[PDB]
Design a protein around this ligand. Structure first.
Ligand SMILES: Nc1ncnc2c1ncn2[C@@H]1O[C@H](COP(=O)(O)OP(=O)(O)OP(=O)(O)O)[C@@H](O)[C@H]1O
Ligand SMILES: Nc1ncnc2c1ncn2[C@@H]1O[C@H](COP(=O)(O)OP(=O)(O)OP(=O)(O)O)[C@@H](O)[C@H]1O
Ligand SMILES: Nc1ncnc2c1ncn2[C@@H]1O[C@H](COP(=O)(O)OP(=O)(O)OP(=O)(O)O)[C@@H](O)[C@H]1O
Lengths: 450, 516, 17, 153, 153
């Protein structure tokens, strides 16, 4: 059955269409008691019917009758052993527990996302007939695919397969031709288009190219402090992978604004090589009432707990909880939930790390969140011209003469800025002319400094 | 024997989208147009889905009608939106199942070698929304969705179907229905580039050109240059109106000449309005002195800073000052003189009597529309009103503020760019409230400081003349003035409505009020 | 609104002589 | 009565199935009345069939109100001393106030999550056949299993 | 059709009261392809039918299915060429650009208080009926009425 097909407008026939199921097997159970051939049933998307009987909030439906009948017929007054009811749903919690207790449905086994080993088998099946019929080229073995597939699940795994063979098929076919002329050529291998279409298929877990917005320009090694930061991050992240009894770990990447905390946070997330990553940020959730915002955050973490491993990046916490300095107002529910979730322990050895970011520690220290965070990190922005112009070299703009021209002014003096501002400064100065560019840049740099 | 599905298609009916048709074709129709000799050697399941998402226009349903009109499958069972829905229970779902029944019958009795069946869901977003939280916890649409997606990838292992869907809001659809196997390809067809647009505006004109019509003077290249973001169908709307103008022209052998020139001003566009500026700049711009040119060439500088640059796709600028000083007008003139396709305004004028949440939504909409196009300069007017701030007591709209601020901090998609503008009359509250940190910079627009500026402002306007202007100049000698010109103009007319005897003395007596 | 007012009706005629 | 099977589209049939349910019983009441058959019915899952007289559970069409016919047959003007009904629910409070009282439904009592003693006894019943067999349940220590298994029932 | 009257609380009737407006003309298209006669539709108050549809959320989606229906009807897969649709209202800013775009509703018009000049012709008409009778002549000059009535509709 396809779930709701059972339901019909007429009353009493809706559940009669259920009774028609077991009234084909109870006869066999009656006349051949033990020796019978196992009538069975296959539901699908059972959540629509067979939810809790107090579902009249929004439903106002007779489906109570349906679940009462089925719940009655399986165990019932009459005993019928030769019945197998198979039921499957993505939302299990809506069910009435009474049909789910043992004796009606005892095995509630839940499938999990394929691991990096098992997806080898998943891919191996769909490639077996190919490599038996001498299609696939030898240069691409399936391990190279498996280790690159982080969170591909099932149909998402076979999608790249089907699409890659489809691409290899497409090349032969060829625009404005009266007929699309498939030159009948047996030679079809599918060599690297799988490795291409890994670009084309995003999974739900992580999208390797969704980091461009956060890291637009990559990472620049202006100095030793950023190396220190990333070193601390990596040696803190080997903790979860190679430890027990610290299954959650919690850090903060704080610092002055316009310093680029989020970027190197996501770089840590990359270089950690975790399967599952997320960036829980306000840039997607805007105008959301506090309850919706909190439930989104809880969807993030209920997605993460599925995984064996996970990292999350909380971005601009102050905006996540809508902090305002004057007439202080703050999402109470969001604060409380965000705080609880730091010290929520995942159920069975699952490992999670949280990377919080903000521009200010003081509000969190007053909100009693800093000690909730396990260990914190500072991000010292550029405090020195000798670091500034080194970063400027690693960029390449303001070439040597301009470098020397500003060197006298900033070599022996302070400059306290962040590189988010630096990029915008140089871009603005660059427009008018080469001759005017350096004095614009410098007068601007002295304008910003208060 | 076997019958080829498409049979006679030759890239007709559409234009502008060739890469997109190709990326649909290889995914969906390649397995179906291929010798089935080795397809079982290859072990491929023919894909069962196509999705189209995009703005209004951009030719998605034309694409879907083309595929199914041209093809020889000849079995299309279009759904018109929520037509499924019925008052009685069970009918809503069974109305779904009577689509798939014919295909399932064919597949059961005839097998793997079989014909095709197509189903075209127009505006799928209404019937299929995300299970779990919808108009209440349970919601009505659980039934149809659980039936649909139980059926497409179901226990039956059915092939011999193609499910096309169209929508404007791709996010509302649920991942259970969008994941691979049910609906693979989610295309992002959007406003075309000039090269695609020319194809459009050539095919909608070829039916005129086959016969001797449309005198040779018209050049579609110029039209493609001056119609950067018409959102598709406005092109053929333009052409239809041009037909109409030539038609009521030759009324006592018609031709269409300079159709774009006549039509472009009249037709509104999804992108920029042709001219909606008069509300903000009704009286024009008079430069009194140097600060005007300073702010304005700074503006064009910062403009070309976007087009001629990478690694800073947006630059946000506040241009503020004392009240009544033309802050909105300068923003509008920057936008006008800058030649931007997506110029738009977010004035609180439009949004009044709205709860702050709806205010937020009518503000995010325009930024999403900007994320569609390549370039834009959006302007927010009177931020202290947009996010309501009252000095007596500290009360403001937290939600709109936070939305606005993160929208400033929002990196748009790869390739796209913004020139966000904002105006305030007061900057100190923003220094309190953290908004300024988000903005790149600040552009002060001083009041008229000196009577030496004021007098040339007056002669530029052209109301007074040398005789009385001598008197006013003599009175203002040496003194300093603190006046916004949107207040000045008011004082001007409030003067001019008195007789010449006490004209100037009323003017000056009102002037000395401000005095600062 | 009071949405999901879905309701069902019954035969009571059973026309027969 | 395997849950609701009395309900049917044609109105009057849902109400009238019960007379067929009670007919042989009242026949034995009237004819051969003194010593009687003592017929029983199980009437499982009242939570479906009975409700708060149609006022609650949304707008339940009058097809739902078969409780009236049931009431009138069990304790109405014509009375029966020869049959007993049983009820079985997971949510009793959803039943109307009317039936639960004496004359209609005389005895009400939960079946509770049993104590350790009863859990030992029930586990003993299931294991007893195997224990009786020589080769099964070696070293099982059902009393240890009972004290281990806290809320299983 | 008046917008406020086709909205029934019971789901399906609200949207399905619209397809009737188009169904007869659709049947005419089945029968006569390109030479059929028009079928005019008049939505007297549209802003209650149509409002700006909700976005990026489950909430704020109330009464959008109607719009999703008629937008699908007037330009859908069954390209329907024989109907011109009227809409008329007093709140032109509530309505979708999705609906106002060419092909669905090509042109928008403004009609406002006519002016003394417009009133003059109105008075010519409604007087001219009496002129036809010829009874209603009292040396009543219409310019008095025009210049007296400034805002009247
Ligand atoms: N080594 C680096 N460290 C920090 N940031 C870098 C580095 N290299 C490049 N970036 C830049 O940092 C930018 C991201 O900074 P981000 O947007 O996180 O700052 P921010 O959190 O917005 O600051 P604020 O919170 O004050 O607005 C990227 O666009 C990137 O170009
Ligand atoms: N490739 C194209 N370029 C420009 N205009 C197009 C193109 N294809 C179709 N049109 C126009 O589009 C119309 C139908 O498709 P349309 O773009 O309206 O669908 P849609 O706008 O996605 O649906 P909705 O209006 O619900 O958003 C036709 O009337 C046709 O004139
Ligand atoms: N630089 C300028 N020179 C001369 N006139 C100007 C200038 N800028 C604006 N104006 C005049 O200002 C008028 C519009 O005023 P505007 O609506 O900008 O007031 P405003 O600056 O928004 O004041 P408020 O912020 O109090 O509303 C226009 O008619 C225009 O002439």
């Amino acid at each position: 059955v396809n779930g709701p097909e059972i339901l019909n407008k007429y009353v009493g026939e809706s559940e009669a269409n259920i009774r028609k199921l077991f009234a084909d097997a109870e006869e066999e159970q009656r006349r051949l008691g033990a020796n019978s051939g196992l009538h069975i049933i296959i539901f699908d998307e059972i959540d629509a019917i067979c939810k809790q009987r107090g579902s009249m909030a929004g439903s106002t439906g007779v489906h109570d009758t349906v679940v009462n009948q089925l719940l009655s017929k399986i165990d019932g007054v009459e005993q019928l052993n030769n019945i197998l009811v198979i039921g499957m749903t993505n939302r299990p919690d809506l069910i009435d527990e009474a049909l789910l207790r043992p004796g009606r449905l005892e095995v509630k086994m839940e499938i999990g996302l394929p691991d990096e080993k098992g997806r080898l088998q998943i891919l191996h099946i769909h490639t077996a007939r190919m490599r038996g019929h001498q299609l696939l080229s030898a240069d691409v073995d399936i391990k190279e695919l498996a280790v690159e597939t982080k969170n591909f699940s099932g149909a998402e795994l076979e999608g790249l397969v089907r699409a890659a063979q489809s691409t290899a098929m497409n090349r032969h076919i060829i625009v404005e031709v009266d007929m699309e002329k498939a030159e009948s050529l047996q030679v079809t291998r599918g060599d690297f288009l799988a490795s291409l279409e890994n670009d084309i298929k995003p999974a739900f877990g992580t999208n390797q190219e969704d980091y461009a917005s956060y890291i637009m320009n990559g990472i620049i090694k202006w100095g030793d402090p950023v190396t220190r930061v990333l070193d601390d991050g990596e040696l803190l992240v080997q903790q979860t992978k190679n430890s027990d009894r610290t299954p959650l770990v919690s850090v903060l990447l704080e610092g002055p604004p316009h310093s680029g905390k989020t970027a190197l946070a996501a770089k840590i997330a990359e270089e950690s090589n975790f399967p599952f990553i997320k960036i829980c940020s306000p840039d997607k959730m805007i105008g959301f009432s506090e309850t919706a915002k909190c439930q989104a955050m809880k969807k993030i973490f209920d997605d993460a707990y599925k995984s064996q491993l996970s990292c999350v990046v909380v971005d601009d916490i102050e905006r996540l909880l809508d902090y305002v300095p004057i007439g202080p107002r703050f999402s109470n529910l969001v604060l409380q939930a965000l705080l609880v979730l730091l010290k929520k322990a995942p159920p069975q050895g699952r490992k999670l790390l949280i990377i919080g970011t903000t521009s200010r520690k003081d509000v969190l220290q007053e909100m009693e969140m800093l000690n909730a965070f396990s260990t914190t990190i500072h991000v010292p922005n550029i405090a020195t011209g000798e670091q500034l112009l080194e970063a400027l070299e690693l960029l390449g703009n303001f070439k040597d003469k301009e470098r020397t021209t500003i060197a006298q002014q900033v070599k022996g003096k302070k400059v306290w800025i962040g590189i988010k501002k630096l990029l915008m400064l140089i871009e603005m100065s660059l427009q008018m002319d080469p001759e005017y560019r350096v004095r614009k840049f410098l007068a601007l740099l002295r304008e910003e400094g208060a | 024997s076997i019958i080829n599905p498409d049979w006679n298609f030759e890239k007709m009916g559409i234009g502008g989208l060739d890469k997109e048709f190709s990326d649909i074709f290889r995914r969906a129709f390649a397995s179906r147009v291929f010798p089935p000799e080795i397809v079982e050697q290859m072990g491929c399941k023919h894909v069962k889905g196509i999705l189209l998402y995009g703005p209004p226009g951009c030719g998605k349903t034309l694409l879907a009608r083309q595929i199914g009109k041209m093809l020889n499958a000849r079995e299309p069972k279009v759904v018109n939106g929520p037509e499924i829905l019925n008052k009685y229970v069970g009918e809503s779902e069974a109305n779904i199942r009577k689509l798939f029944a014919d295909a399932e019958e064919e597949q059961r009795r005839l097998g793997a070698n079989s014909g095709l069946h197509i189903i075209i869901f127009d505006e799928i977003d209404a019937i299929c929304k995300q299970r779990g939280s919808m108009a209440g916890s349970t919601g009505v649409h659980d039934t149809v969705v659980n039936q649909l997606l139980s059926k497409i990838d179901g226990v039956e292992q059915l092939n011999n179907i193609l499910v096309i869907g169209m929508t404007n809001r791709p996010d509302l659809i649920d991942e259970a229905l969008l994941r691979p196997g049910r609906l693979e390809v989610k295309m992002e067809i959007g406003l075309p580039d000039e090269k695609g647009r020319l194809q459009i505006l050539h095919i909608h004109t070829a039916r005129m050109r086959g016969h001797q019509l449309l005198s040779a003077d018209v050049d579609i290249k110029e039209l493609a240059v001056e119609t950067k973001n018409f959102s598709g169908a406005e092109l053929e709307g333009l052409v239809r109106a041009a037909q109409s103008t030539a038609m009521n022209r030759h009324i006592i052998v018609t031709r269409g000449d300079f159709l774009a020139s006549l039509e472009n001003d009249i037709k509104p566009a999804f992108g920029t309005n042709q001219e909606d500026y008069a509300s903000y700049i009704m009286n024009g711009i008079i430069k009194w002195g140097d600060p005007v040119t300073r702010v304005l060439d700074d503006g064009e500088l910062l403009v070309q800073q976007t087009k001629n640059s990478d690694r800073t796709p947006l630059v946000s600028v506040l241009l503020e000052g004392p009240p009544h000083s033309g802050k909105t007008a300068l923003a509008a003139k920057i936008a006008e003189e800058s030649n931007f396709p997506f110029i738009k305004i977010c004035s609180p004028d439009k949004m009044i009597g709205f709860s702050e949440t709806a205010k937020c939504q009518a503000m995010k909409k325009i930024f999403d529309d900007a994320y569609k196009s390549q370039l834009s300069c959006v302007v927010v007017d009177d931020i202290e009103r947009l996010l309501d701030y009252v000095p007596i007591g500290p009360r403001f709209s937290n939600l709109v503020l936070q939305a606005l601020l993160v929208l400033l901090k929002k990196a748009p998609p790869q390739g796209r760019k913004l020139l966000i503008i904002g105006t305030t009359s007061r900057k100190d509250v923003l220094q309190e409230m953290e908004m300024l940190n988000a903005f790149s910079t600040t552009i002060h627009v001083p009041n008229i400081a000196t009577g030496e500026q004021l007098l040339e402002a007056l002669e530029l306007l052209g109301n007074f003349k040398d005789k009385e202007r001598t008197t006013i100049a003599q009175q203002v000698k040496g003194k300093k003035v603190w006046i916004g010109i949107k207040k000045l103009l008011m004082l001007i007319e409030m003067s001019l409505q008195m007789d010449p005897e006490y004209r100037v003395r009323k003017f000056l007596a009102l002037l000395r009020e401000e005095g600062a | 609104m009071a949405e999901d007012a879905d309701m069902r009706n019954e035969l009571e005629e059973m026309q027969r002589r």
